[PDB]
Amino acid sequence: GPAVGIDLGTTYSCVGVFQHGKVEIIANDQGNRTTPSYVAFTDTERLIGDAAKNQVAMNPTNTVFDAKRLIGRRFDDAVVQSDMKHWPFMVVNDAGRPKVQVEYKGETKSFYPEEVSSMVLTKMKEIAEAYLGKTVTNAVVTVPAYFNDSQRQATKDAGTIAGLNVLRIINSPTAAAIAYGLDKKVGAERNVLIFDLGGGTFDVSILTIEDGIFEVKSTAGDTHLGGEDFDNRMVNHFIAEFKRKHKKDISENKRAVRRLRTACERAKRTLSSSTQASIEIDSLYEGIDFYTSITRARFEELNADLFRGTLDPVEKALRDAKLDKSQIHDIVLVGGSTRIPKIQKLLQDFFNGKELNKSINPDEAVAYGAAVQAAILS
């Protein structure tokens, strides 16, 4: 069985396999090339991936996500403390270790963050195995560059309990670089900038590659800035619109809002290729159908400050690395949010027209690289 590369993401995960000199990013049951890092517990079953996310509005307290933010940390971590105040699921202390508490089959159960991730990892494994038609054991899993030893350990453990023999844990920026073959020895030092704007995290990393050896010169970003924030801006915009037209503030109905958000995330994606998308939601509030639309122009303006602010961390990364804008040789786009045209324009204008590397879907870049690395390692 060939080794696979797995991108264990904060919001979405992806798995790819190197086969016959080519890397294939594997699609799941629903045909998606990335699957949400969601796990849901109901009266009758345990849902993972699309099935889990597809019922979040209906089962909020028992639908777990953002496990990557918990993994490898302590309950006392100020991060954990700050974060938990935003999740609809319970997090409890267990001898210093945080645990997610849910109700599975009427019985109350709690899980260590590594167990939730192992569930997502299991899903990826099934996906690869269904595709390959054979058992998958060896794997290369990615982790952010800033993950400490504990977090790396936990990620490794999540792998082992999923029945995966984790060959190596590599940083995602390095994985992105390898996908573009930027590790090929050219007899010279190379500076690369990884711009990773994902579902909920923003990471900028500057790598220096010499003789086939990576060196993370600097990193910057925002652990709480991703595609979700753009979705919210759309949500708030439409709540205001619904109220003007119907005089009904749907803010309190957690379901109506969550449904609108799902509709927005979908419209958002369409806006990356089309200039406008329609929002068709039957019975949003009471029995009122919400039928409307947004233009790319309006979308961009609703997130103007967020998009623009994206550059500040880029400047920081440069100065920490002691490099000038002209000294970086390659710029690679990672993360689903980098498919947004306004983000690409903005980064390019900043780097004075420099060509951006983005022939490989940004949300599949990390998986692609890990698959290549898995291959060389096995």
Choose which of 144, 159, 198, 369 interacts with ligand ADP (CB under 6 A).
198
Residue 217 as a binder of ligand ADP (CB under 6 A): the answer is no
Subset of 325-344 contacting ligand ADP (CB under 6 A): 335-337, 339-340
- State how far the Cα of 132 lies from the Cα of 223, in Å rounded to an integer: 35
Q: How far is CA 272 from the centre of its chain?
A: 17
- State how far the Cα of 161 lies from the Cα of 244, in Å rounded to an integer: 52
Which one of Mg ion, ligand ADP, none is in contact with 222 (Cβ closer than 5 to 8 A by kind)?
none
- State how far the Cα of 347 lies from the Cα of 338, in Å rounded to an integer: 10
Residue closer to ligand ADP (CB basis): 194 or 321: 194
Residue closer to Mg ion (CB basis): 294 or 333: 333
Q: Which stretch binds Mg ion (CB under 5 A): 40-48, 197-205, 276-284, 314-322?
A: 197-205
Residue closer to ligand ADP (CB basis): 12 or 307: 12
Choose which of 269, 298, 329, 354 interacts with ligand ADP (CB under 6 A).
269
Residue closer to ligand ADP (CB basis): 326 or 359: 359
Residue 258 as a binder of ligand ADP (CB under 6 A): the answer is no
Which one of Mg ion, ligand ADP, none is in contact with 354 (Cβ closer than 5 to 8 A by kind)?
none
Looking at residue 67, the DSSP 8-state letter turns out to be G
- State how far the Cα of 288 lies from the Cα of 367, in Å rounded to an integer: 42
Choose which of 5, 6, 11, 140 interacts with ligand ADP (CB under 6 A).
11
Residue 173 as a binder of ligand ADP (CB under 6 A): the answer is no
Q: For residues 16 and 361, is the Cβ–Cβ distance under 8 A?
A: no
Structure tokens at 356: 């951006």
- State how far the Cα of 358 lies from the Cα of 342, in Å rounded to an integer: 14
Choose which of 4, 5, 8, 9 interacts with Mg ion (CB under 5 A).
9
Q: For residues 355 and 361, is the Cβ–Cβ distance under 8 A?
A: no
* C-alpha closest to that of 344 among 266, 247, 272: 272
Choose which of 5, 144, 159, 199 interacts with ligand ADP (CB under 6 A).
199
339 is in an annotated binding site: yes
Q: For residues 8 and 143, is the Cβ–Cβ distance under 8 A?
A: yes
Report CA-CA distances (Å) from 373 to 16, 34, 134, 206, 334: 11, 19, 20, 20, 17
Torsion 15-19-22-24 (CA) sign:
negative
319 is in an annotated binding site: no
Binding site for ligand ADP (CB under 6 A): 9-12, 34, 198-199, 201, 226-228, 265, 268-269, 272, 335-337, 339-340, 363
Residues belonging to the binding site for ATP are: 9-12, 68, 199-201, 265-272, 336-339
